[PDB]
Design a protein around this ligand. Structure first.
Ligand SMILES: OC[C@H]1O[C@@H](O[C@H]2[C@H](O)[C@@H](O)[C@H](O)O[C@@H]2CO)[C@H](O)[C@@H](O)[C@@H]1O
Length: 322
C-alpha cells in the first residue's frame, strides 16, 4: 500500500491518445514513428470546466488498477484583473459543488489509485500577485484550496499534491510560500497532502526545480509541515527556457518520460509526471499579449486545443532523444 501511487503502472487516457492521433495522421516517416511512441506515454487528465464532473467516471472505468492522475483546475477567479472569466466557478459554493461531485464519484471506486493535483497557478498568485483590490478573491482562493484538501485529503484511494508554482516564480519566496501552504493546511480539516507539484505547465529543468524543492521543503519544515514529497512536470522541459515567457514557448522539448523515484540523489522527488498536456495550447495567441512575445510560437489555438505545430516542435526538441 505504498503512498507513492506512481510506483504502480500509469494510466494512458483516450483523450491524449486521440490528440496524438490527429498528429499521426498529418505526419510521415520519421516524425510519425516518434509520434506513435508518444501516443501511449501517460499524461494527466485535466478537470478544467464545469462539465468535467461527468468525465471522471469514464476515466476511472477505463483505467482499472492503473494510477489515474487528475488535475483539479476549476477554481472561481484566475486573475484578480479586469476581463477574466470562462473557466471558474461563480463562487465558493459553486466550487464546493464541483469538489463534492468529484469526491462522490471517486468514492464509488475504492480500488482505483488516484493522484489529485490541486489547482495549478493558485498558490503562485497568492504569493506574488498584488493585494490592493484583490483581497476578496485571495481569501476565497485560500478557502477553495482548504476545502478541496479537506475532501480529497481524506479519501484512501487518493493522494493529493498541492501545486506550488516553479522555481523561476517562487524560489526567492520559499518562506512566504510555506507560510500560505501552512495556513491552507490548518483549515483543511482532517485532509492530508502527500506533497507538492511543481513546474506545472512550465519549462524549468529538473536540476533547478529540485533545488527549489529543497528550499521550499525547508520552509515548510520550519512551519510544522513535515514529510512533504514532490512531483515535477517534465512534459515540456527538455531544453532550458530562453526566457520567462510561459505561453507556448519556442524551442521547448518533451522532457523525461514519466517515472517513479527517478533519482536516488533526489530523495524528496516522488516522480517525473507529464502534467500539462504536451501539444495543447497554453492560450490563443490573440488572447494575451504575452502570447505574442518574440519567443512564443504563433497561430496558437485556444487554451486546451491541440496545437499540431507545437507538438511537432516538442517532438523534434525531445530530451532524452529517441
Ligand atoms: O507556470 C505557468 C503559469 O505561468 C504564469 O506566469 C508566471 C510565470 O510562469 C513565472 O515564470 C513568472 O515568474 O511569474 C508569472 C506570473 O507573474 C501564468 O500567469 C499562468 O497563466 C501559467 O499557468
Amino acid at each position: 500500500t505504498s503512498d507513492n501511487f506512481f510506483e504502480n503502472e500509469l494510466y494512458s487516457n483516450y483523450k491524449f491518445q486521440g490528440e496524438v492521433d490527429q498528429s499521426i495522421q498529418r505526419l510521415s516517416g520519421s516524425l510519425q514513428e516518434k509520434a506513435k511512441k508518444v501516443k501511449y506515454v501517460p499524461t494527466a487528465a485535466w478537470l478544467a470546466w464545469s462539465g468535467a464532473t461527468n468525465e471522471v467516471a469514464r476515466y476511472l472505468n477505463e483505467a482499472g488498477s492503473k494510477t489515474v492522475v487528475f488535475v483539479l483546475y476549476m477554481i472561481p477567479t484566475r486573475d484578480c484583473n479586469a476581463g477574466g472569466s470562462n473557466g471558474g466557478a461563480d463562487n465558493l459554493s459553486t466550487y464546493q459543488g464541483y469538489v463534492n461531485s468529484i469526491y462522490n464519484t471517486i468514492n464509488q471506486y475504492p480500488n482505483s489509485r488516484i493522484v489529485m493535483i490541486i489547482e495549478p497557478d493558485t498558490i503562485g498568485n497568492l504569493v506574488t500577485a498584488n493585494n490592493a483590490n484583490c483581497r476578496n478573491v485571495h481569501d476565497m482562493h485560500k478557502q477553495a484550496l482548504s476545502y478541496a484538501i479537506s475532501k480529497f485529503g481524506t479519501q484512501k484511494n487518493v493522494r493529493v499534491y498541492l501545486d506550488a508554482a516553479h522555481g523561476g516564480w517562487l524560489n526567492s519566496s520559499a518562506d512566504r510560500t510555506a507560510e500560505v501552504i501552512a495556513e491552507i493546511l490548518r483549515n483543511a480539516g482532517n485532509g492530508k497532502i502527500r506533497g507538492i507539484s511543481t513546474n506545472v505547465s512550465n519549462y524549468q529543468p529538473v536540476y533547478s526545480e529540485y533545488q527549489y524543492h529543497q528550499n521550499l521543503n525547508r520552509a515548510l519544515e520550519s512551519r510544522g509541515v513535515r514529510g512533504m514529497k514532490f512531483i515535477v512536470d517534465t512534459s515540456r522541459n527538455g531544453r532550458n527556457p530562453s526566457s520567462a515567457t510561459w505561453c507556448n514557448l519556442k524551442g521547448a522539448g518533451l522532457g523525461a518520460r514519466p517515472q517513479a523515484n527517478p533519482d536516488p540523489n533526489m530523495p524528496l522527488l516522488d516522480a517525473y509526471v507529464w502534467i500539462k498536456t504536451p501539444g495543447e495550447s497554453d492560450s490563443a495567441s490573440s488572447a494575451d499579449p504575452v502570447c505574442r512575445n518574440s519567443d512564443s510560437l504563433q497561430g496558437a489555438p485556444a487554451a486546451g486545443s491541440w496545437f499540431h505545430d507545437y507538438f511537432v516542435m516538442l517532438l523534434e526538441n525531445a530530451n532524452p532523444p529517441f
